[PDB]
Amino acid sequence: IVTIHQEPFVYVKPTLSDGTCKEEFTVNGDPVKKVICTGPNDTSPGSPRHTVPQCCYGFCIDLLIKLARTMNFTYEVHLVADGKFGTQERKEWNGMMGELLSGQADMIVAPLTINNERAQYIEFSKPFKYQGLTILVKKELDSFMQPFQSTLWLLVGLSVHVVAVMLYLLDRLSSAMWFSWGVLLNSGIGEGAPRSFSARILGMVWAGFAMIIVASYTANLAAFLVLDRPEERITGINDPRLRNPSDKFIYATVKQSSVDIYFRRQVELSTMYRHMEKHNYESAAEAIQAVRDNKLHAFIWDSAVLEFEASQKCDLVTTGELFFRSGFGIGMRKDSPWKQNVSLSILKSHENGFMEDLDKTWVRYQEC
């Protein structure tokens, strides 16, 4: 069995000196220990590495255990040094598809997208987890006075001082300023206006100003608060920025995957790929690390793992229409007698909600 090192579906954890490590118990309890997998130490970072056995549980281990229990067949989980998913040569296949074609593994139980060429060469049976492609972008609290500024504060202070002094200038003293300060914001004093000739008119005039200014301040701060930042910056492929490549924007996708096949399927999308074919990444982890530091504008075509990455990071938002609707399946060799058995087993497991239980127990655990 060939498996890919996708952290949301297959986590990477080196074993201890004893050859095995005990998995931490969950809320439900009774954790399932992952089988020994001979994966690369660092996924071949440009240099050969020893095939040190590592423990990798992730998400697909439970599905593989269920399939093995239903079909009663032994399994040998191992990764690939190249790490590629599969694409056209340069007349053969490379990565997991190449391993399947070469006969090294008779079946592949791993998260893998399905396209025209892959479906033609091998059968994916029935998918278990459906995921439509979406884009993720790294996402990029008011003042204590809101609409008023330092200049506005000085102006209003000068105005209130002027009206306060004019009150006792027209009345004639010192108590007028204190009364004005007290009545500026609720409160009140027992003296009040004299209301002899024109004091009552001035008091009535200077009674609604406070209500008006506080209402304006509240309205301005409420308008500022409801000024939510735009989250749907790119509306999928329909967005002109996504449809038409730009020098400033950088498009990143997993190399040697079904993304290249999908882009080459449509001629009108060739300028989407050919103009942006040198920015691909051989591994998704490197792309995620690069986009964490805001080095990459956005990432696409890994939605089934991009959603989990965004949930775990709680910083990168996910938008875009689900233009490519498909699901992860299990791959078998050509004319494999076990294809019907595994298809029936996966359909039976999906019917009773085992996949939903696994999803709600693992993916829903990290909600952010």
């Binding site: 007290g182 009545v183 024109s198 005039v205 100003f209 209500m211 304006s216 509240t218 309205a219 449809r243």
Partner: protein, 355 residues
Amino acid sequence: KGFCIDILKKISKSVKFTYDLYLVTNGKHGKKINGTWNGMIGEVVMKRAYMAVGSLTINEERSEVVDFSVPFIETGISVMVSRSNGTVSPSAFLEPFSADVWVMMFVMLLIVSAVAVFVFEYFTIGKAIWLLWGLVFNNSVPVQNPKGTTSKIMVSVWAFFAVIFLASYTANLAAFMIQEEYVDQVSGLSDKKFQRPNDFSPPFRFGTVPNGSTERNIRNNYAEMHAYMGKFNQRGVDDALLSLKTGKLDAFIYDAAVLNYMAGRDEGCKLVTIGSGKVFASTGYGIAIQKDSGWKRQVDLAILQLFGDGEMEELEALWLTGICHNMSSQLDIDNMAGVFYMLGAAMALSLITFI
């Protein structure tokens, strides 16, 4: 490649012929330089290229020398200036809504004051008016003019009604504050400020780019506008957009389609266009053909057939659709100047009454 390339490909698909695109040798567009044209117009009048495709604005001078074709996209002359940040109109003191509600509240205050004076009789009027104002504006605690408790029900219910009215006024103000009309100080070329910047305000630049059909049209329409814009002759398109973004360039008076595309790009959030569908000299980018062989009819029919179908609409949606098109609320002193003006008017009225 581009929108014009797609149009040419569609034309070739509809009508089978041979074409060989050639870049412009000298200049950018047509210009009557000592009676000799240049650019695409100069090439087509010299029989170098029978068909001219590009940003060739249709005008009488261009049509006189070389025949035009049916336009497929509407363009013209537009102004895209957004450096100034204008807030909402200063209507906080007196909003257009509830215009008669203030008068109704005033007459109700007068009526309740008269009723209170009458029941007290069976300085009183002034005390009742002061109590009503204190209960309404809730600025300060009013002195309780009545001495008994039976009459307190009326003043309590009136104070409750005044509180409800004040709450409704605050809610209406909050609802009005979320408006995002963004009425900028823009009027178009018809405004005297744009026509004669020197007479209106020396800190103003037309920014019209020369060597183009729009510049020639502006010069023919108004000589003063051309003379004013000659001191701010920008070069290129990207440089002019960068200058406008940095604030060095006051405004852009280039083609409407180019302005819309620039406003729809990354550097267009603070450089939006006028926002009005109607533009000055509404024309299109028709293909210039010599029509010597009578081939204009075929290309016109092909363009009409393409426009009738949905290919033109989807192509325009793919290409001629920018981003960040059309609450971004902002605070300014002019927005709050209304309450200051109202306070000044009230103070002047009080001073006049006292004197």
